[PDB]
Amino acid sequence: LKAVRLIKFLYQSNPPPNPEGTRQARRNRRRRWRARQRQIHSISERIRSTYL
Amino acid sequence: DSLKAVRLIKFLYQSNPPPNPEGTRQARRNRRRRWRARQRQIHSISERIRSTY
Amino acid sequence: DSLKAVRLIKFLYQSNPPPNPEGTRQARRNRRRRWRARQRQIHSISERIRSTY
Amino acid sequence: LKAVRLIKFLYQSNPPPNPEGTRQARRNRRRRWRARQRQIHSISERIRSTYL
Amino acid sequence: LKAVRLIKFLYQSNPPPNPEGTRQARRNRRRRWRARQRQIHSISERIRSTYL
Amino acid sequence: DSLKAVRLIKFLYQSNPPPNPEGTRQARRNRRRRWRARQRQIHSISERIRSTY
RNA sequence: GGGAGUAUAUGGGCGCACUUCGGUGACGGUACAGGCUCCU
RNA sequence: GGGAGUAUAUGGGCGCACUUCGGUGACGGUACAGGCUCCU
RNA sequence: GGGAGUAUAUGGGCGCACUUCGGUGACGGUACAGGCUCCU
């Protein structure tokens, strides 16, 4: 489908971090999530650059 | 149309080089794991393209 | 002072044109509802101005 | 009173959305709330432009 | 230690406000917290300016 | 190294002037309280510097 | 409703401590009160 | 405390699976550990 | 998943009220439905 839709699908495929646990654990989970988001952004950029 | 999508997927796959088989077993394992994750994402994309066709 | 406030309220009211009585009964109803909401807000303003006088 | 006070009253008259329900429902409620906020901003702008 | 570390220690020494209570009380607590943050920022700036 | 830290602490302390002993007992009290808070923060800093030495 | 700033600001009366009973306390207080300005 | 980035990065030892018992696994792992830099 | 905008926009069928039973209601509705575009 449209590139935008695929990208939205990619962002949808990133699960939110677990709120339970110690502050450090939750912090780590958040950081992992953010890393995933960064990756999604990068690959989304490389997708949008071509394919259209 | 479809050709552009196929070329896109093949491009994404080609842009994902194999992991480095060096260091401890754990290090190699997790490099292979990250790599496999990337591959998995690309396949998710391709499969979604196939699903809408 | 007060004259400016009255002119303001009358201006806001005049700036809110009547809804379009076209289409299905539901469409007309909800146009009238949005319109009535705007009118209600303007009256809330005016009433608050009257309350502080 | 002062225009700013009236505007604050307008923003006070916008109820926060219901957190309960499905993700889609909550999403819709949030969107409605945001629309209301946009309206408040517009009319606040048109008020502040005159009246002073 | 490094100035940055000391500053981080200062920001760590600012306790988050109490979520319990009335809206006005919580508002006040948040404002106090924000004031504390502003202070921390100011003194952090005056520290970083010198000492290095 | 350490000299710069000592100079820093003394500087922070010197940059914190005594409160104003004027007005009601409460006002003076809370000026002294704010002042004491600032002093306390500076000492927290100095003590942390001493702890890492 | 939310936010920013004024703010290295303002200080109100309860409770403790001390007292020569008038008051005093760099004590509870990193508490509490939240005005004014603007933004949303 | 919060955030950003380093990071298309780093990999530690538990449990499974396999085994020629030395090890191996693109298995639990989208888990888990969170250093360094800066911001607040 | 989140956000912005289109939007001073679009209006779908349940329940009330009225009715000449065809319909009507600036009634529940500041409810509810959430498409399209882009961002993350």
Author numbering:
A (entry chain C), D (entry chain C), E (entry chain C): 13 to 64
B (entry chain B), C (entry chain B), F (entry chain B): 11 to 63
List passages from the publication reporting this PDB structure:
Rev cooperatively assembles on the RNA using its oligomerization and RNA-binding domains to form a Rev hexamer on a shorter, but functional ∼240 nucleotide RRE. This assembled RNP then presents Leu-rich nuclear export sequence (NES) peptides to interact with the host export receptor, Crm1, targeting these RRE-containing mRNAs for export. The binding of Rev to the RRE is nucleated at the stem IIB hairpin, where the α-helical arginine-rich motif (ARM) of Rev binds in the major groove of the RNA and makes an extensive set of sequence-specific and electrostatic contacts. Crystal structures of Rev oligomerization surfaces depict a central hydrophobic core that mediates interactions between Rev subunits and positions the ARMs on one side of the Rev oligomer to bind RNA and the NESs on the other side to recruit Crm1, highlighting the modular nature of the Rev domains.
As a step towards understanding how individual binding sites are organized on the RRE, how their arrangement relates to the architecture of the Rev oligomer, and how the different sites are recognized by Rev, we solved the structure of a Rev dimer bound to an RRE fragment (IIB40) containing two Rev-binding sites. We circumvented these problems by making RNA complexes with Rev 1–70 harboring the oligomerization-disrupting mutations, Leu12Ser and Leu60Arg, which forms a stable Rev dimer, and a Glu47Ala surface-entropy reducing mutation, which aided in crystallization. The overall architecture of the complex shows the RNA held between two Rev molecules arranged slightly asymmetrically in a V-shaped topology, with the two Rev ARMs buried in distorted major grooves positioned on opposite sides of the RNA. The Rev dimer in its RNA-free state also displays a V-shaped topology but its conformation changes dramatically upon RNA binding, with the two RNA-binding helices coming much closer together in the RNA-bound complex. The Rev subunit bound to the junction site forms an extensive surface with the RNA that causes the dimer interface to pivot around a single residue, Ile55, known to be critical for dimer integrity and function. This altered conformer results in complete repacking of hydrophobic residues at the dimer interface, formed by residues Leu18 and Leu22 from the first helix and Ile55 and Ile59 from the second helix. Interestingly, the bound conformation buries less surface area at the dimer interface than the free form (1000 Å2 vs 1500 Å2) and also shows looser hydrophobic packing (the two Rev subunits are ∼3.2 Å further apart), suggesting that this bound dimer is energetically less favorable but is compensated by the energy of RNA binding of the second Rev subunit. The weaker interface may be further compensated by hydrogen bonding between the well-conserved Gln51 residues symmetrically located between the two subunits and observed only in the bound form. The junction site in the RNA forms a structural scaffold that helps orient the Rev subunits.
